[PDB]
Every structure is written in C-alpha cells, then in structure tokens.
Design a protein around this motif. Structure first.
Motif, mmCIF file in Angstrom:
data_model
loop_
_atom_site.group_PDB
_atom_site.id
_atom_site.type_symbol
_atom_site.label_atom_id
_atom_site.label_comp_id
_atom_site.label_asym_id
_atom_site.label_seq_id
_atom_site.Cartn_x
_atom_site.Cartn_y
_atom_site.Cartn_z
ATOM 1 N N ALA A 124 0.861 -1.200 0.000
ATOM 2 C CA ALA A 124 0.000 0.000 0.000
ATOM 3 C C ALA A 124 0.891 1.242 0.000
ATOM 4 C CB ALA A 124 -0.920 -0.026 1.190
ATOM 5 N N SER A 125 1.943 1.197 0.789
ATOM 6 C CA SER A 125 2.802 2.355 1.088
ATOM 7 C C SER A 125 4.223 1.824 1.273
ATOM 8 C CB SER A 125 2.272 3.046 2.303
ATOM 9 O OG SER A 125 3.126 4.086 2.714
ATOM 10 N N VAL A 126 5.213 2.614 0.878
ATOM 11 C CA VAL A 126 6.649 2.246 1.025
ATOM 12 C C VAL A 126 7.490 3.505 0.803
ATOM 13 C CG1 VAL A 126 6.872 1.478 -1.397
ATOM 14 C CG2 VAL A 126 8.503 0.696 0.324
ATOM 15 N N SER A 127 8.530 3.669 1.605
ATOM 16 C CA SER A 127 9.581 4.694 1.411
ATOM 17 C C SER A 127 10.927 3.981 1.373
ATOM 18 C CB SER A 127 9.514 5.729 2.492
ATOM 19 O OG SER A 127 8.639 6.779 2.119
ATOM 20 N N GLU A 220 1.492 4.272 -2.581
ATOM 21 C CA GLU A 220 2.251 5.503 -2.237
ATOM 22 C C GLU A 220 3.741 5.126 -2.193
ATOM 23 O OE1 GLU A 220 0.167 8.287 0.806
ATOM 24 O OE2 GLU A 220 -0.858 6.368 1.183
ATOM 25 N N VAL A 221 4.577 5.753 -3.004
ATOM 26 C CA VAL A 221 6.052 5.631 -2.895
ATOM 27 C C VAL A 221 6.643 6.950 -2.381
ATOM 28 C CG1 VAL A 221 8.177 5.251 -4.197
ATOM 29 C CG2 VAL A 221 6.089 3.919 -4.727
ATOM 30 N N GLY A 222 7.326 6.898 -1.247
ATOM 31 C CA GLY A 222 8.100 8.033 -0.727
ATOM 32 C C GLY A 222 9.586 7.862 -0.947
ATOM 33 N N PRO B 41 -4.387 0.199 6.036
ATOM 34 C CA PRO B 41 -3.539 0.465 4.863
ATOM 35 C C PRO B 41 -4.208 1.407 3.844
ATOM 36 C CG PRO B 41 -3.597 -1.880 5.393
ATOM 37 C CD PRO B 41 -4.688 -1.228 6.213
ATOM 38 N N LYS B 155 5.521 10.441 6.233
ATOM 39 C CA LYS B 155 6.000 9.951 4.919
ATOM 40 C C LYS B 155 5.411 8.566 4.704
ATOM 41 C CE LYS B 155 10.178 12.306 5.297
ATOM 42 N NZ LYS B 155 10.627 13.707 5.329
ATOM 43 N N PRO B 156 5.289 8.099 3.446
ATOM 44 C CA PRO B 156 4.780 6.750 3.179
ATOM 45 C C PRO B 156 5.508 5.602 3.914
ATOM 46 C CG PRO B 156 4.816 8.061 1.158
ATOM 47 C CD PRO B 156 5.562 8.856 2.210
ATOM 48 N N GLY B 157 4.726 4.770 4.613
ATOM 49 C CA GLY B 157 5.172 3.553 5.316
ATOM 50 C C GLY B 157 5.949 3.871 6.578
ATOM 51 N N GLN B 158 5.938 5.120 7.064
ATOM 52 C CA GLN B 158 6.677 5.511 8.291
ATOM 53 C C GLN B 158 5.661 5.907 9.366
ATOM 54 O OE1 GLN B 158 10.273 8.096 6.677
ATOM 55 N NE2 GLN B 158 10.803 6.307 7.948
#
Lengths: 225, 225
Positions: A124-127, A220-222, B41, B155-158
C-alpha cells in the motif's frame, strides 16, 4: 500540441443531475476513443466507461444507470443521472492509445461535490532512500495476458502513463522503470530512485472488455531524506 | 534515550481476541499519559483512547465495547475484544505532551491482520507545488476547539511526526518554514520554501481534552513536482 480538458464540476445537492464536458485539442474524436475515470478524495482511480471513435459506448457494471456518455465532434460528455454523496470525486477524461483500453493523454480533472475482475496491488505504502529500489506487485483475478498499464500520479496532479503492454515504456519515461509479468502476476521496479519519483503508482487492466477493465488500489512511494 | 515500541501484531481469525503491548524507554508511565491510534492500509489516522498517568481511561465513542486499555508499571495494553476484518490496521501507541491531548513520541506501530461528536475537514485532499513554493492546508472543526490543534507529518510507510501543537507552537527539531495559525473552527498550516524532504501526508488533530472532541483530519498528500 495535443491536449484534453474537463469542465462542469461544482457543488450540487443529492438527486440534482449534472453534466461534465471533455473538450479535446489537436486531434479528432472521429479517430480516437475516449474514457472517463473518477477519484474520490484520498481514494484511488475507478473506470466509468468508454466511447469509441464510431460512438459505441461500454460502461463498467457498477456505473450502468448511474452515468450516461455521449459525444459531439469536439466534446465527450458525462451525465450523472442522480448523484449521491458517494459520487463526490475528481472526474478525468482520458484518450485511449491504439493497442489496449489504456490512456496516454489525461485532463487536469474536474471536481464534483455532493452535499468482474479484481486487481490487488502490494504494498500500500513504502519509502526507500535516494538511489534505492522499490518493487510493486499487482495480482489479477483472471488472466489479462499482456494488457496491463502502469501510471504515476503526484499529489493533486493527473496520472501519467509510464508503461503499457506490460513492459513497453511510454515516450520520455526513463529505463529505471521496468515492467514485467504475464497473465495474473505483474511487477513494476523503480531502480536508482530519485526525489522526482515520489508518487502514487497504479496498475490498470487494459483488457478490451468493460468487465475486465480495472485499476489497482494504488501504492504511495516516498523517498527518504 | 526516550522511545516507544508496540508488539503483539499478527494474523488472526474474526472473533479471536488479541492483546497488543506498548513498552516505553526513557520516561515513567507515572508521569506521562499514553493513547492508541490505528491506520488501515491506504486510509488515515483514527484515535481509539487514552489512559492518564493516574490510570483514568477515555475511549472514542465508536471504540466503546470494541477495545479495552490497561497498564502495568512499564507496559500499556490494548485489547481488541472481538476483531472483524474492519480492524485490520497498524496500531500505534503515542506519548501525550503536557498541555493538550496530542502526542510528541510515536512508536513504529504493529500490524494486525483479520482474515478468513466533532468532525475535522481537511482541504485540499492533495496538492503539489514547485520547489521553493508555498503550500497552504485548511482544517475545519464542526465545533469550536479553541487553540487545541496539532499538525503531524507522515511519509509513506513511516510513523507520524508532530510538527505543531497549540495551533502555532513549533515542536522540537521542526524548522520555521512550517507556520500554524487559526482559532476556534478555522486552522491553517503553511509550508514556505518547499523542499523535496517536505513531500508527505499532513494531518490536523483536535487535541481538545474530551473524548467526544478528539478527532483526526482525513489527511493532505503534499507533493513537490
């Protein structure tokens, strides 16, 4: 220069019908097909329906009765038959590229306020840090062969096509973006990550049937700094 | 030295009760209050409840019956009495800062999977400005909440980071480019001299000291384009 622009969006009370317009510049609706997509605030992309250059319309099953598409020589129109609060969204018209039911040219979108294939996207989300690698997985309920496109969407901007036909790179997209997959399993890998790459990425089934056209939930990519 | 960490998250079948633990370092649960927040998510932040340093508990109205809070000398516990698929989320414990029911120290969160009354309105939902630009986010409260408003960056995934508390007071480490202002029902955050580092989701939170008035905004995705 070829461009697309939507208009008609405004605040409305439930049940009050509303028509949106999509006006095109630099090409003929006698040559190109057009389709409508919506995006509720915070939620992801959803396909509504398509109209061919010859004026043949196909609607998503959920949209039948809720929406009417029609066209003039220069305008594609979307009517919301009987709005509810669930119809509050940004509405985009998109120009179909030749090979598949995907879109290469998107409008800025118009905001409306009101007072069966499944695509599974992970994660779903990752940085990741600058120079890093991100891999997004997309999983289709039924086999869609090579009919898959990847889009990039920065916050408050329109989607940009990166990849069509599973692995083919759109013009101006750098080779750091690699698409691969077949049938039911697809992946996008962003190598040598940059600040510019921070966005939401969506996979879309571009299979040529209204039952099979579907968007993933988004990733979401950070970029860490 | 000062940190927070959650534990207990796992896959579970609907109805199987589950307890999560929040263990702290560098401060006493005799001094500081702790509260629980969850985030499905892709979705936004939601407050569950708070336990004072003296062990007085308040739950969100939606949470009553669904969740139980308790504490030992070193652990704060959250029990999900009867999970459903709608309880699938990352669960955070947060340390309350002195003046308001806002939190300055967040844990990494623990993921729970389940498988087989004040309203805060954030405008706009998504926005991109160019590097060096200015971004302005509006947060609107259903009832007057005086100066009890905090702004968080995620931020994404944090995990979330506190930027601003008491409407305009700047948290430790946060640069002056972040400006908070407002009173009663209308509040705004302005990011001056935009940078790539600033691209994130920003949330307003009513930090009013009553469980019927504690609420999170739906979020604003900020991009840098």
């Amino acid at each position: 220069a070829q461009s697309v622009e939507e208009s008609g969006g405004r605040l409305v009370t439930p049940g009050t019908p509303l028509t949106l317009a999509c006006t095109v510049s630099g090409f003929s609706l006698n040559t190109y097909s057009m389709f409508w997509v919506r995006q509720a605030p915070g939620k992801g992309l959803q396909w509504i329906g398509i109209i061919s250059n010859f004026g043949v319309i196909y609607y998503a099953t959920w949209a039948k009765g809720r929406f009417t598409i029609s066209k003039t020589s220069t305008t594609v129109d979307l009517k919301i038959t009987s709005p509810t609060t669930e119809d509050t969204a940004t509405y985009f018209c998109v120009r179909k590229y030749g090979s598949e039911w995907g879109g290469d040219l998107w409008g800025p979108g118009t905001l409306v306020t009101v007072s069966e294939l499944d695509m599974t996207q992970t994660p779903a989300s990752v940085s990741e840090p600058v120079g890093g690698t991100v891999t997004i997985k997309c999983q289709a309920s039924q086999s869609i062969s090579s009919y898959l496109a990847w889009y990039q969407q920065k916050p408050g901007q329109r989607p940009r096509l990166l990849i069509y036909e599973t692995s083919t790179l759109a013009s101006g997209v750098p080779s750091r973006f690699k698409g691969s997959g077949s049938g039911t399993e697809f992946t996008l890998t962003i190598s040598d990550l940059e600040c510019a790459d921070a966005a939401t990425y969506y996979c879309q089934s571009t299979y040529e049937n209204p039952t099979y056209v579907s968007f993933g939930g988004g990733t979401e990519v950070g970029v860490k700094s």
